[PDB]
Amino acid sequence: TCPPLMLYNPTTYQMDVNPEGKYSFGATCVKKCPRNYVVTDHGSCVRACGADSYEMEEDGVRKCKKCEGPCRKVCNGIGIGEFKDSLSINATNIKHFKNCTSISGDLHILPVAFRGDSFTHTPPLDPQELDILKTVKEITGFLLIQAWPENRTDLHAFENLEIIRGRTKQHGQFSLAVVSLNITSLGLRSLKEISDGDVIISGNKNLCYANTINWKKLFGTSGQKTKIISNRGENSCKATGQVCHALCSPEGCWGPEPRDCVSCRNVSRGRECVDKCNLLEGEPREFVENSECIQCHPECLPQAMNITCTGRGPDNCIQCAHYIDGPHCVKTCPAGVMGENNTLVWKYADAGHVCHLCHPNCTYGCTGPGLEGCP
Amino acid sequence: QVQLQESGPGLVKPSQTLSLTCTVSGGSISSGDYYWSWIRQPPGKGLEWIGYIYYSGSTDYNPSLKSRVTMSVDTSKNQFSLKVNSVTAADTAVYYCARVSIFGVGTFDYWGQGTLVTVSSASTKGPSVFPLAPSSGTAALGCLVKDYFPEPVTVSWNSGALTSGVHTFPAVLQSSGLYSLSSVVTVPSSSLGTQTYICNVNHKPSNTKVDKKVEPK
Amino acid sequence: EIVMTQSPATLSLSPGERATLSCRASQSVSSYLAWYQQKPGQAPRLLIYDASNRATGIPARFSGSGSGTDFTLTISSLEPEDFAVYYCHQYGSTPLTFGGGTKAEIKRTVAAPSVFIFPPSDEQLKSGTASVVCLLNNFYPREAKVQWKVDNALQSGNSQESVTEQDSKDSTYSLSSTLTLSKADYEKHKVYACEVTHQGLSSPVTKSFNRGA
Ligand SMILES: *[C@@H]1O[C@H](CO)[C@@H](O[C@@H]2O[C@H](CO)[C@@H](O[C@@H]3O[C@H](CO)[C@@H](O)[C@H](O)[C@@H]3O)[C@H](O)[C@H]2NC(C)=O)[C@H](O)[C@H]1NC(C)=O
Ligand SMILES: *C1O[C@H](CO)[C@@H](O[C@@H]2O[C@H](CO)[C@@H](O)[C@H](O)[C@H]2NC(C)=O)[C@H](O)[C@H]1NC(C)=O
Ligand SMILES: *[C@@H]1O[C@H](CO)[C@@H](O[C@@H]2O[C@H](CO)[C@@H](O)[C@H](O)[C@H]2NC(C)=O)[C@H](O)[C@H]1NC(C)=O
Ligand SMILES: *[C@@H]1O[C@H](CO)[C@@H](O)[C@H](O)[C@H]1NC(C)=O
């Protein structure tokens, strides 16, 4: 391969960024998969986009990036697929989801379900294999849970579903429904957009929280009825304090484990509420911003005194568990690194500060600026 | 089309057990569109909600009722059913079975007829259907239903076709620890002779159901 | 539980006039609330659910109204055929509770106690006892004390009366008392007499017969 981007330039100090030699996978350093073909992530230049992961066209050029991850499989059913006319999921049949991103049309965990059906040769569903299924993050049609195995306590398997699109409803109005289950917190930590249709949380009855949500906030339409009905009365709920986390924003929660928060009383850490941040006390490294609680660069050096990060990204931070290099605190100092006008530089290694340049070719490890470097 | 007939025991002995059965005319008990429920009403009072049952386990009963009830659902005869055990002096009332609609109204929308059940010691009694031929310009005959327990007695004239201008007085707790009540209908004085009246009386706890034809005095 | 406190117990009003009714729920039932109507002998009839909407169809005059902890039943202009006890009925939080009631009675003119007096029988006394029953269609209003006269003087109390509820189609009443007596004491007198004391007459009317005759 000829060089992608540029090659170690010595002002930026990060193999940047243009041009030199071109690109290809067609076994020909030119440019660039003309009309025909796309381009791999790894600086190739292929055709048909590397199944995992997808295509994309920033700046009219057809790069092809990483799915991150699950990739996106849209599935269908129940009745039709797949699937085809069939009460709830069962039991069979649930297997037809492994790796469903999001799954057009509705979905019923009805209890003719785990019960098993004979009448149609169908073993009870295993609560286990109901975690199929956290691969799901969207629903075109609607959720409809009237069965749910009662030594569960939330809608766990449904913990990554982000969205209940419109798009069809249980009866001609009603997009999410959770009629009379045994659980105790909805457990819908990733659903914050019910596109359209109505929520009805009927007769749950050990069911705390789930009426602290400001529902309208998730509703992308006009007359969005949320009918919270016959449930665990909020004193029953106050008497345990299945109250939202102390640590939780005024906004809400869905369980009580802080992760179950809606937005945070203090700051957040990457999916779950937190006390305060670690920018000052080590542990993942850490440093605040926008109230999220981002870690530091791997190559930073902590401190009782100082803080360890002025921000995200490698360079800007307080010190260095591997030398330094202009701004850029390098993990391992470059050595044999080509090119730029054909040069495999070739830089190291003065103590206290950064790396200094070598003298021609030297694939061997060369010291000072003077001469005595390469025998 | 749909309807919730309450059925079974008139009397129950104390410390013994109430069980009643509801049923389900024009609709398939077994679907998530409905909680099927029970409320009772101590005679002279507000309704008290008991509990209910979805088409899969999930009952929820009234804490009030102190763990005594349970519900359940024979799907054969397409019905569902009460028991209250430990029935007391104060359990005595009228049990309504009724339907809730979740997706409709979230509420009771069809109740059945309502059934009586008196909790109590001894002991059943069919009555006697004495006629009340009148004696004097538009007349009034009647029936006397006496020596009977338990209240409810149900009277009627010409099998529900002498409806109009009829008055069935409330309960009478005569000291005879028995019950009685007086039932009358005002006809045109003229022609007692012609549109005649056997009074279709009945007390269904006991197995009695007799209609004495009120002949003129 | 989560107490409904219907007020005010008892409401007599009179035709085409506005009727105004209300629970205060002990904690907020958001909107989850429905109103009902027990007419004697039958029971309930859901009328409004959620505040607010009338089922299908209850009569448009039926109205309510309310969110939070205080809601209101407004019957708009009352029939006679509005004679019932009316009920609150929450569904927000198990346990479901109803309110206290409100008995709603409708005031009419005043009518006249049209009395009848039918004597005991053989099919009655040929067992062991028998009882002479005196009537009382089809009058108004409430309080209206009886008077009994078995061949002669007094009175008082061992013979018993049973009142209906306000009639469904004119809001009259209807009463009935029973001189009972063993086949020996309603035997050992000749012609027992009825008298009623009625405000819609002058004139405590005596209407009776000899047995018989
Ligand atoms: C468990 O899932 C299975 C599918 O996993 C369901 O069994 C299915 O039952 C359906 C009813 O729609 C069968 O349809 C039939 O199609 C045949 C030809 O295939 C036709 O002769 C009939 O008209 C009939 O309707 C379908 O074959 C079958 N799916 C398969 C292939 O297994 C079942 O309902 C699920 N159990 C429940 C209640 O969840
Ligand atoms: C669902 O996604 C999984 C990934 O977890 C796919 O399974 C395979 O991954 C394992 C090892 O990671 C291998 O056995 C296979 O080579 C993968 N299959 C591929 C990519 O062809 C799995 O096939 C998917 N399941 C279904 C039902 O399609
Ligand atoms: C249905 O849920 C209720 C609540 O989860 C269960 O009853 C509780 O179970 C826990 C288990 O840690 C007990 O310590 C609680 O105290 C129970 N609640 C009370 C006060 O009754 C029940 O387990 C569930 N149904 C089943 C057995 O699956
Ligand atoms: C929940 O029920 C099943 C038993 O089959 C199992 O997944 C798990 O061990 C159970 N026990 C609990 C309450 O954790």
Short mmCIF file of C-alpha atoms in Angstrom, two decimals, chain C:
data_model
loop_
_atom_site.label_atom_id
_atom_site.label_comp_id
_atom_site.label_asym_id
_atom_site.label_seq_id
_atom_site.Cartn_x
_atom_site.Cartn_y
_atom_site.Cartn_z
CA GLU C 1 -57.54 2.59 50.21
CA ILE C 2 -57.92 6.08 48.62
CA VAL C 3 -61.31 7.49 49.90
CA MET C 4 -64.04 9.02 47.75
CA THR C 5 -66.17 11.43 49.76
CA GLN C 6 -69.36 12.15 47.70
CA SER C 7 -71.36 15.21 48.90
CA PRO C 8 -73.97 16.03 49.81
CA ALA C 9 -75.68 12.78 50.78
CA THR C 10 -79.21 13.83 49.90
CA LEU C 11 -80.58 16.27 47.26
CA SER C 12 -84.25 16.89 46.55
CA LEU C 13 -84.71 19.12 43.59
CA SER C 14 -87.57 19.66 41.15
CA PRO C 15 -87.93 19.25 37.35
CA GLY C 16 -85.84 21.08 34.71
CA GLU C 17 -83.76 22.64 37.56
CA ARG C 18 -79.91 22.22 37.83
CA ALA C 19 -78.51 19.41 40.04
CA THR C 20 -75.02 19.70 41.40
CA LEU C 21 -73.04 16.80 42.84
CA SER C 22 -69.40 16.02 43.91
CA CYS C 23 -66.63 13.68 45.40
CA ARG C 24 -63.51 15.07 46.90
CA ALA C 25 -61.00 12.34 46.46
CA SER C 26 -58.52 11.96 49.37
CA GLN C 27 -55.55 11.90 46.92
CA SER C 28 -55.43 12.91 43.25
CA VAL C 29 -57.15 10.45 40.97
CA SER C 30 -55.69 12.47 38.07
CA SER C 31 -58.82 12.23 35.89
CA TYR C 32 -59.62 8.55 36.40
CA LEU C 33 -63.11 8.96 37.84
CA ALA C 34 -66.51 7.82 36.75
CA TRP C 35 -70.01 8.57 37.88
CA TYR C 36 -72.85 6.08 38.40
CA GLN C 37 -76.53 5.78 39.07
CA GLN C 38 -78.20 3.15 41.13
CA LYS C 39 -81.92 3.11 40.54
CA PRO C 40 -83.52 0.69 43.04
CA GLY C 41 -83.69 -2.99 42.27
CA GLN C 42 -81.21 -2.72 39.48
CA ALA C 43 -77.73 -1.37 39.76
CA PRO C 44 -75.17 0.75 38.50
CA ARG C 45 -75.19 2.71 35.32
CA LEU C 46 -71.87 4.38 34.28
CA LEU C 47 -72.61 7.82 33.02
CA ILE C 48 -69.41 9.59 32.93
CA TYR C 49 -65.96 8.30 33.03
CA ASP C 50 -62.74 10.27 33.29
CA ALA C 51 -63.87 13.68 34.60
CA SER C 52 -65.67 14.18 31.85
CA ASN C 53 -67.11 11.98 28.98
CA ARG C 54 -70.50 10.46 28.78
CA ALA C 55 -70.94 6.85 27.76
CA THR C 56 -73.09 5.93 24.99
CA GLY C 57 -75.52 7.27 25.21
CA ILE C 58 -76.37 8.42 28.59
CA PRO C 59 -78.52 11.67 28.18
CA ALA C 60 -76.67 14.84 27.37
CA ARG C 61 -78.00 16.55 30.50
CA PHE C 62 -75.66 14.38 32.45
CA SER C 63 -72.58 16.32 32.97
CA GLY C 64 -69.24 16.30 34.84
CA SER C 65 -66.49 17.89 35.21
CA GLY C 66 -63.42 17.86 37.48
CA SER C 67 -59.75 16.86 37.69
CA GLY C 68 -57.27 16.41 40.52
CA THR C 69 -58.93 15.70 43.74
CA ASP C 70 -62.26 17.59 43.26
CA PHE C 71 -64.80 16.66 40.49
CA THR C 72 -68.50 17.46 39.98
CA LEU C 73 -71.60 15.69 38.74
CA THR C 74 -74.01 18.11 37.12
CA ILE C 75 -77.34 16.74 36.13
CA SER C 76 -78.44 19.73 33.96
CA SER C 77 -82.23 19.83 34.32
CA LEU C 78 -83.73 16.91 36.20
CA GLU C 79 -86.39 14.42 35.19
CA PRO C 80 -88.65 12.60 37.64
CA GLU C 81 -87.05 9.57 35.89
CA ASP C 82 -83.88 10.78 37.49
CA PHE C 83 -84.76 9.23 40.67
CA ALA C 84 -81.60 7.31 41.83
CA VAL C 85 -78.59 7.20 44.14
CA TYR C 86 -75.56 8.48 42.22
CA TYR C 87 -71.94 7.21 42.66
CA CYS C 88 -68.17 8.36 42.36
CA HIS C 89 -65.88 5.46 41.35
CA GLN C 90 -62.11 5.91 40.79
CA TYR C 91 -59.77 3.55 38.82
CA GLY C 92 -56.40 5.23 39.10
CA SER C 93 -55.11 3.22 42.07
CA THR C 94 -56.13 -0.13 43.47
CA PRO C 95 -57.93 -0.59 45.53
CA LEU C 96 -60.85 0.83 43.58
CA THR C 97 -63.12 2.77 45.83
CA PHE C 98 -66.52 4.42 45.38
CA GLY C 99 -67.95 7.41 47.16
CA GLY C 100 -70.68 7.65 49.82
CA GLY C 101 -73.64 8.28 47.54
CA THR C 102 -76.01 11.00 46.86
CA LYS C 103 -79.73 10.13 47.10
CA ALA C 104 -81.49 12.47 44.67
CA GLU C 105 -85.19 12.84 45.13
CA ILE C 106 -87.44 15.02 42.95
CA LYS C 107 -90.19 17.26 44.49
CA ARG C 108 -93.75 17.00 42.93
CA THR C 109 -97.21 18.69 43.68
CA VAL C 110 -98.89 16.88 46.59
CA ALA C 111 -101.14 13.85 45.98
CA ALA C 112 -104.01 12.10 47.79
CA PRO C 113 -103.64 8.78 49.73
CA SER C 114 -106.14 6.69 47.65
CA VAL C 115 -106.66 3.93 50.38
CA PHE C 116 -107.94 0.30 49.93
CA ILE C 117 -108.88 -2.23 52.65
CA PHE C 118 -108.80 -5.97 51.84
CA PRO C 119 -109.83 -8.34 54.68
CA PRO C 120 -108.07 -11.63 55.77
CA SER C 121 -108.98 -15.02 54.12
CA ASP C 122 -109.69 -18.78 54.63
CA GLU C 123 -106.69 -19.60 52.43
CA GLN C 124 -105.11 -17.24 55.03
CA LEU C 125 -106.87 -18.01 58.36
CA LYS C 126 -107.57 -21.74 57.63
CA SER C 127 -103.94 -22.31 58.55
CA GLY C 128 -103.58 -20.50 61.91
CA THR C 129 -103.45 -16.67 61.71
CA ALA C 130 -104.28 -14.42 58.64
CA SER C 131 -103.86 -10.60 58.33
CA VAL C 132 -106.08 -7.69 57.22
CA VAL C 133 -104.08 -5.40 54.89
CA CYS C 134 -104.78 -1.73 54.20
CA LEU C 135 -103.16 0.04 51.24
CA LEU C 136 -102.13 3.59 50.24
CA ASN C 137 -101.56 4.46 46.64
CA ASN C 138 -100.17 6.61 45.09
CA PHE C 139 -99.44 9.80 46.82
CA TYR C 140 -96.97 12.44 47.84
CA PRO C 141 -95.03 13.54 50.11
CA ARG C 142 -93.01 11.60 52.76
CA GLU C 143 -94.15 11.80 56.42
CA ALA C 144 -97.86 10.62 56.67
CA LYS C 145 -98.89 8.66 59.90
CA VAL C 146 -101.61 5.93 59.68
CA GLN C 147 -104.72 5.20 61.85
CA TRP C 148 -106.23 1.76 62.62
CA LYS C 149 -109.70 0.77 63.98
CA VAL C 150 -110.53 -2.89 64.66
CA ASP C 151 -114.31 -2.82 65.40
CA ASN C 152 -113.39 -0.12 68.04
CA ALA C 153 -110.88 2.07 70.02
CA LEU C 154 -107.04 2.34 69.39
CA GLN C 155 -104.13 1.29 68.45
CA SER C 156 -101.16 0.90 68.79
CA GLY C 157 -98.26 -0.93 67.04
CA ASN C 158 -98.27 -4.66 66.11
CA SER C 159 -99.29 -4.40 62.49
CA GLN C 160 -96.69 -2.98 60.10
CA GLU C 161 -96.24 -0.64 57.08
CA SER C 162 -93.87 -0.78 54.06
CA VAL C 163 -93.13 2.27 51.82
CA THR C 164 -91.86 2.23 48.24
CA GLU C 165 -89.30 4.58 46.81
CA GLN C 166 -90.23 7.69 44.85
CA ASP C 167 -91.95 6.42 41.72
CA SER C 168 -89.87 6.36 38.58
CA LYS C 169 -92.50 8.09 36.38
CA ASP C 170 -94.22 10.82 38.43
CA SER C 171 -92.45 10.79 41.76
CA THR C 172 -95.44 9.59 43.78
CA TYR C 173 -94.95 7.26 46.73
CA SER C 174 -96.92 4.10 47.73
CA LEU C 175 -97.51 2.73 51.27
CA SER C 176 -98.99 -0.48 52.84
CA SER C 177 -99.70 -1.52 56.47
CA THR C 178 -100.84 -4.85 57.95
CA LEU C 179 -103.13 -5.54 60.93
CA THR C 180 -101.99 -9.12 61.50
CA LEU C 181 -103.75 -10.96 64.45
CA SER C 182 -104.35 -14.67 65.25
CA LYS C 183 -107.38 -16.51 63.76
CA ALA C 184 -109.01 -15.68 67.10
CA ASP C 185 -108.63 -11.90 67.59
CA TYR C 186 -109.38 -10.79 64.00
CA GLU C 187 -112.09 -13.39 64.41
CA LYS C 188 -113.47 -12.02 67.69
CA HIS C 189 -114.47 -8.59 66.32
CA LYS C 190 -116.93 -7.69 63.45
CA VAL C 191 -115.89 -4.89 61.04
CA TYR C 192 -112.40 -3.43 61.30
CA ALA C 193 -111.95 0.13 60.07
CA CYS C 194 -109.24 2.03 58.22
CA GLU C 195 -108.43 5.69 58.59
CA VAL C 196 -105.49 7.68 57.19
CA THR C 197 -104.39 11.17 58.14
CA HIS C 198 -103.68 13.03 54.85
CA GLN C 199 -102.60 16.68 54.28
CA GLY C 200 -103.77 16.54 50.63
CA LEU C 201 -107.31 15.99 51.94
CA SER C 202 -109.03 17.98 54.76
CA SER C 203 -110.02 15.55 56.61
CA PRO C 204 -108.49 12.25 58.04
CA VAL C 205 -110.51 9.92 55.68
CA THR C 206 -112.12 6.71 57.03
CA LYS C 207 -112.52 4.01 54.30
CA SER C 208 -113.43 0.40 55.42
CA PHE C 209 -115.57 -2.87 55.37
CA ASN C 210 -117.33 -5.71 57.37
CA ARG C 211 -115.96 -9.23 57.03
CA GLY C 212 -118.08 -10.42 55.39
CA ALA C 213 -120.14 -9.54 53.40
#
